Amino acid sequence: LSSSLKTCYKYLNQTSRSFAAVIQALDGEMRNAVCIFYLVLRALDTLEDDMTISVEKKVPLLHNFHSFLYQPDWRFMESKEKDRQVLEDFPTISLEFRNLAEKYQTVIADICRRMGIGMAEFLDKHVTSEQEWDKYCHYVAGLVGIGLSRLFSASEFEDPLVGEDTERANSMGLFLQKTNIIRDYLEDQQGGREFWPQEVWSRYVKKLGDFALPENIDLAVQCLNELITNALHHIPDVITYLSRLRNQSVFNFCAIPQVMAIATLAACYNNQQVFKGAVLIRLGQAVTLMMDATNMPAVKAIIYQYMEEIYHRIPDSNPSSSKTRQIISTIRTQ
Amino acid sequence: LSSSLKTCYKYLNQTSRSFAAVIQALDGEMRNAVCIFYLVLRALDTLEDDMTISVEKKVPLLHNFHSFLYQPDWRFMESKEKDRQVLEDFPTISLEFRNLAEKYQTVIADICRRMGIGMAEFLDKHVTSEQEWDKYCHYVAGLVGIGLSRLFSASEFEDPLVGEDTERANSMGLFLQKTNIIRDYLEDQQGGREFWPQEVWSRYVKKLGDFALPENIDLAVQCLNELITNALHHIPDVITYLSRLRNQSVFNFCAIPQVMAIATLAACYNNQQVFKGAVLIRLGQAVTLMMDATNMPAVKAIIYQYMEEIYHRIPDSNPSSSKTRQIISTIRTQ
Amino acid sequence: LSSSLKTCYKYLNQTSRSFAAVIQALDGEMRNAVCIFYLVLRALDTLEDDMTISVEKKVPLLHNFHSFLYQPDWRFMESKEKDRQVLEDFPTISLEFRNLAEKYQTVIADICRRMGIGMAEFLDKHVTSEQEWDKYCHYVAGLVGIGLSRLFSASEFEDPLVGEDTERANSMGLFLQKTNIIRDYLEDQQGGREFWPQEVWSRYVKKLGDFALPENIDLAVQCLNELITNALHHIPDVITYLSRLRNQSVFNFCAIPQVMAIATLAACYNNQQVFKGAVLIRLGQAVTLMMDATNMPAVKAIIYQYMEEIYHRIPDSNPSSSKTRQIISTIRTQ
Amino acid sequence: LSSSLKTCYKYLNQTSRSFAAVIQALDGEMRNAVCIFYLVLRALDTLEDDMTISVEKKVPLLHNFHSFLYQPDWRFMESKEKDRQVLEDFPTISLEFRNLAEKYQTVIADICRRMGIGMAEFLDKHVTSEQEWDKYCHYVAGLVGIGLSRLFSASEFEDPLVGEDTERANSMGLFLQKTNIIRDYLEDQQGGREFWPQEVWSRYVKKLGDFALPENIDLAVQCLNELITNALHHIPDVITYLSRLRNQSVFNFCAIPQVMAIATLAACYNNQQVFKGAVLIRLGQAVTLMMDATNMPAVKAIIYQYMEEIYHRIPDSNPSSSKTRQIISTIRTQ
Amino acid sequence: LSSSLKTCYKYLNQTSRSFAAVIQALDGEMRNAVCIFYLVLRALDTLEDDMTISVEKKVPLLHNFHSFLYQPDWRFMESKEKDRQVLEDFPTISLEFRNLAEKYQTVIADICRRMGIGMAEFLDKHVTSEQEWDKYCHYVAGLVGIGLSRLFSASEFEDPLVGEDTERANSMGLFLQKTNIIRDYLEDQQGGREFWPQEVWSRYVKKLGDFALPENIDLAVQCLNELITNALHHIPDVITYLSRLRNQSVFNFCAIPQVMAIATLAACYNNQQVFKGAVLIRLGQAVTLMMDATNMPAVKAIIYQYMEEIYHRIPDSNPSSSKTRQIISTIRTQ
Amino acid sequence: LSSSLKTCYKYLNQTSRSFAAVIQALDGEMRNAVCIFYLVLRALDTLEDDMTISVEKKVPLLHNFHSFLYQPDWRFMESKEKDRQVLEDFPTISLEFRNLAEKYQTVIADICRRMGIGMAEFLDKHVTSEQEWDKYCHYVAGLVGIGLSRLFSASEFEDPLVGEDTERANSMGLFLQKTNIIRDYLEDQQGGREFWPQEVWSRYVKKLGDFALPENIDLAVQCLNELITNALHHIPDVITYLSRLRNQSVFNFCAIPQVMAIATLAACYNNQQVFKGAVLIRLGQAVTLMMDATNMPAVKAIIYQYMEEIYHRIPDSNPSSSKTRQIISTIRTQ
Numbered sequence A, B, C, D, E, F: 001l002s003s004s005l006k007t008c009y010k011y012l013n014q015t016s017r018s019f020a021a022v023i024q025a026l027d028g029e030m031r032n033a034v035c036i037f038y039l040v041l042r043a044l045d046t047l048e049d050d051m052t053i054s055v056e057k058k059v060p061l062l063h064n065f066h067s068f069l070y071q072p073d074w075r076f077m078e079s080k081e082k083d084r085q086v087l088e089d090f091p092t093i094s095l096e097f098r099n100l101a102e103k104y105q106t107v108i109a110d111i112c113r114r115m116g117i118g119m120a121e122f123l124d125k126h127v128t129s130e131q132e133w134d135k136y137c138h139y140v141a142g143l144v145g146i147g148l149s150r151l152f153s154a155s156e157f158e159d160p161l162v163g164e165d166t167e168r169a170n171s172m173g174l175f176l177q178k179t180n181i182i183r184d185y186l187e188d189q190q191g192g193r194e195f196w197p198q199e200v201w202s203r204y205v206k207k208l209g210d211f212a213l214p215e216n217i218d219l220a221v222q223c224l225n226e227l228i229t230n231a232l233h234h235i236p237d238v239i240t241y242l243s244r245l246r247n248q249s250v251f252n253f254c255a256i257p258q259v260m261a262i263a264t265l266a267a268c269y270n271n272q273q274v275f276k277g278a279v280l281i282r283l284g285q286a287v288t289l290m291m292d293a294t295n296m297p298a299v300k301a302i303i304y305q306y307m308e309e310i311y312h313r314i315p316d317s318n319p320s321s322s323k324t325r326q327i328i329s330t331i332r333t334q
């Protein structure tokens, strides 16, 4: 019907290779709510990425983005980023945002407000400590998990307990983000962006860029393995979060991406290829090829299979070997 | 128990490459009702297929087929087709037909009667307009969908609405038949049959067979895309139909073929391979590799994913490009 | 919490390539109960396998194994088998066994007692009759299915009937054991172990080992098909058992191995490769690659498909051909 | 099966009028856990109650009571209290405690250690301030609510948030205790124990025992009303707590006592009978006489009705009148 | 939060002795929506009540009441009725009305309009025919059931069919209103209000008020029984309606009142007390004393028991004996 | 609609003091199916009760009763029993029976047959051993439970596992029957019928009627307790049976009768009143007066409370005492 809503779903598919389908498969009111949430977040993220926008011009844009949702004519025409159209045709997006029930608007605007402050905070600095890593990931992904959880509950398709558990919801976002940051080292490196925590990579090399030098491959993998081990600590929370869900369309939406990130970490673990090029995500063992990620018991088994894929490859010599076995042990035994 | 019922199930597995498994997995009374229904339709389809049966003899056979279901000793012994066994031993099958609850008999006979009349009508002509294309598919597949739907409701395993909404049920069949007709262009051409609507292909070449000529590949593909674009229009109905199902065994039976057809059309889209041989039914992206077609939400996501696969390949120079984008856009927004 | 329980799960993953994942996915109490059960069975199985332990020395260990579960310090340090770790660190396993609720201990201890008795029984004899084959399989697998079934009922996650029907539960074990025995012919031969029932292979050759000879390949496949035909008889019971399950985690745990077994039999049927090396278990038709083994209707479909995969490869000449067709027919018509 | 567990349930019934039935009705694991938890707390409570034991001998016992749980032979044979049997045959109870899953053991032991510390602390003093009243109630009731919530979560029959939100769990306990303390004024005076906050009753009389004086009945009722108004403040939390529950057996166990407590408070409100004898708990209005406390909405309705029963009888002349009306309004509106 | 909303709930508990509790127990948005709806209906009803308000001054107030919802300052200070508080502080109510999601406002406003119209229409006449009785009940209660039903569907806590089947919803209001009109005969007569249909009572006496004269007690009871029999015809629709509800909080809200109405009719049937004083609503047999009205099957059982309580007390010589038996027979059999 | 069906429901209410309401509350096809099943069962029982019918005339009526269901004009106008109307108007009943789906007919027919056979057998003898007592109860109550269970499963409102479990369905029946037999001793004696197992009452008195003698009150009570103790042994099965149920209407129907019987036994236990006059069924403690029997945990709680009510009154001086405690402790610990 609505031509503007049509445009939004067009944008959703243009900017989301890996979420559009599951988003469109969401039950009732969640469909549009999550679609709109994805688009405005996409716009806020594009603003953050655009390095052609000076920091002093970017801070206000990020700080006041949540208010733009209520400015019918607001738009940004100076972006040179690839997803710039959601910024250039933002009026069509904010229009549909204002068409959403108020309970959804409140959540989306709140997350944008907080995300903007968070992104602005890290514009002038690099992630140093692992604690700072969690903070950054909390700002660009954790809040997304929290926001989404609140939309699920406000829609009534999910229990109020889902949106209430902000800790676990934050973990869902932290896990996906860390996995992406780890996987995209080379890509981010070649792009002038540094996301790997400094207090970690500085124990291996002088400059993050050195992991890009073939003569430092050994040290690079060791660091890679330490970061992966860090990310695995979020899996217990992920499993707890998914176990609470009761709506199938919501379960598929939340589970598939977590399982893909896990498959991603398994393929990247102790993999020199992370620093040479792209890594191929292989489908799995025999038991996995018999199930898919659409029921909780099956999701656990698929995760456990991937954990052993890793556990099996842990080199006694890796300086994170014990930590890696420990967290995988915890995941198995829980 | 019954040896004749056993023989029936033997013939089902011998004559149904892709439906036998799901049919045998159907709950209660539906199992036998659908088994027999499949057997008589296959027998009817074989009569129509056999080019060694003169039109003079064929017309009466197709018109009166439905009544043979009531004649204990009727059988045909002159078929040369591969599945002739269901015809030569029709008494065994007709015997089991008469054992079904009267309510299922009504549906089965009614569909055979209408289908036979329909097949007789197309013995002396080819499909011309797109309207005739729908009419033809209605007779050989649409009615099959209507029949099955009415059986589902009659058995009470599915809501009355399932059997009542004949339009949606018809679409389910039309989508599969059109998809198969598109896929099998080359196999049918070498077989002496023409199913592609003449009013569509005549606007590209002079004879349908011209598409098999390496020098016409481009026009051939433009026609392929137009027809695929025609088939895509049934998807909203397929989704509506599937979303109404409540029985797991019925859901698997109905959803599996649909998703298969959809992946098939995605693989054929703008693919020149359609005119050189058989086409690869890929595997999917990552989001799909983690989902199977057993719950509505997952099916929607898989369908939406295949829709994007097609959307990504729509060349701007294709004369149907705008139409193809249009229908996909509607499927996303609904 | 407990580090001993963690060690147990470490052992589970070290000794079980294909069960660990689905075992860890079991709901609540069944998780640790099945884990521990798997581990004690594995310890008992290892003692049994060890050919460096004389029969006189071995018998008392098998007979009293169930009692060692209550000897806090008991362990066995003289094994050279691959999984000896579970025997050498048995106190860690029995400690957790004694932590399980008493109702579970009773079931596990009872199965261990009866299994040791049976295992002792066969230390000095080979399998002769087919009836002896069922008894041996009952001892090393059938009882496992009965034990597990009693754990499911006692946990209340499954109906009281699952545990009470020892016959259906027994068939579950027999089917997996027979399938493995059939598949591992060559590996067992080169190991000095013989499990194919003598009365069956003797009607084809003088020494079971002759099947390993290239010149007897024809008689080999014939024996292979007769045994496979024997195994198929448990499938009706397998299906009955699975259709009573109501817990999803227990369903995945029970269904997946049975399906893998069936896929294996289909692959081995009329295959010379069984006598030359490892057999490649391949994908499946189209209808199967669309579904996974996590819902009863889908499992039925998957099974029916493999049945037809065997059925239509049955050589007219084969001595069992008519037996094979008859059981498959019974499986479909039920 | 085991007579020691049978014996435990025997003691559970001898020592609990209003809990034994609902406790035995708890699903799976929670049954024995809560049963044992109840028995040990009853044993601890019996020691504390016994004025026959000297303070310097009682303190160490209360402090180390948690440790006896691990001492197979520990037992107390010098008590004169009615429920002395649980102390005399503690080995039976501790044996079963040690048979519970470790996760339950640590929760129970932890609560017993903390409860003992608080109990010892209040041996030589009475409740002065209202803040002290919460503290005393925390030690003898709040912690039980926290302990039970942790057990519910650990059993997985309830959400992780139930065991995490110790504040809400605490309120469940404080509400029941305060109510009982308010109700049992007379009974306690005649027993030599003082539980009404001195800082509260002191503003009305000179000695708590004066409310027992006919001539002071009016000051009494006013103090009664002030304390009840204090208790009514835990209701919002009680509603928050009960709203998170998803297991019916746990819901019954938690909701029934809360509702009875609220009925008791409504009956005692501005009732002189409190200072004369036992107060009878009425029938409830018409709306409540068609609803039982087994589903949250019904429980809410029941609670709201009792709130009105109290709101209707608030005397303007009462000094707490405004406060009372306020808390009720907050409960109504949330 | 909002002090105005707080005030609204205070008035709800002031003006509604029997709906306040279940309204406050409604889930999410239905809570405030229904509370406000009740308040505005109460104000409209109180205007209509005030005899101190001349006809030509009242008619406008009734017709334009639906508009005062949007007049921020609108308020009436000349009422003497007991619930005058809601008219004097109407802006507070109207304010909260405007805070509701428009989809709710739309429903409420539409009902207040159609209600004021009908109310106006009856200001100068009495109820003559039975058809006119239905019309009057439609206006003061039927429309209410429609409005509430439409609020439920718009909240989506209930299926769309609920707000769709206006006839069934109308029946809900008609059953309650008739029951109350029957029950409050004396109270209404003493107030100068006559709601019993003249075409029914004039067959017994000359003036409806004569039923208040002890000498006409027998005739009064006969008429009483005729009207009750009339009311019973709405029961089939009440059961149908309730059976479609899916939200527990909505079910309690709807079922409790209906069950209390049926119990009231049962107590009033062939009961002289109706004309002497008030009637006590009876416990219930033994089967009912074992269930509450919170689940459909239980509600049906309660309803059937009350029908039998009536059926057994039907006097053969009663003028409606056959009609009464007929409808109760219809109810049992459906 | 059907006037014959209406008449059927009139007889249900006429002949069934307690079950009518809950039977009419059953979902869909179970309603009529169970109503009709109750009527035929009542007719068949009335034939048996009629002592004016000679044994040689009675026997054939019983054995062939099951065939009368298909004999349209069959009826019996010679009964003097109070419920004779069901026999005289049997054609109305047999008519509606034949309107029931064939699946329901089979069960009812099958049950009547087997029940008639069993009733004939006991026409000339008395219940001797307790094993005989179970046999009799099996024929007049147990089979009813087996039938109902099958009707539930056949209707598909209850899982197939309910119909299958015959031993527990039997226990359900045996418990009610034994309970009524124990309660109606006096009434059965003054009626010339003896049902207490001779082998048990013979160890107390010479003639079962002696218990009616005030001089044997002590031996009477003792015998009473020994029988009640006997009955209690069915409770574990009763609890297991109900725990399996999933449909609410079926649950109320099954649960309520069992709770009443339990309450009955509780009131009768060690109560002389049994031999003097009608026994009264008490309220039930505080906790129970808070729950109804519509959810399994509440039912367990109710049962457990009544069990305590009996355990409390077990006199050490009784000779069954140990047996009584033993069984109750088992019902509690399981």
Ligand SMILES: CCCCCCCCCC[n+]1ccn(CC(P(=O)([O-])O)P(=O)(O)O)c1
Pocket: F015, F016, F017, F018, F019, F020, F140, F141, F142, F144, F145, F146, F148, F149, F169, F172, F173, F176, F177, F180, F253, F254
């Ligand atoms: C599967 C749940 C039901 C299993 C038991 C079904 C048979 C019950 C046998 C007891 N029985 C015998 C006579 N009655 C009639 C009973 P009623 O219809 O309420 O008059 P009651 O006189 O109250 O005991 C019941």
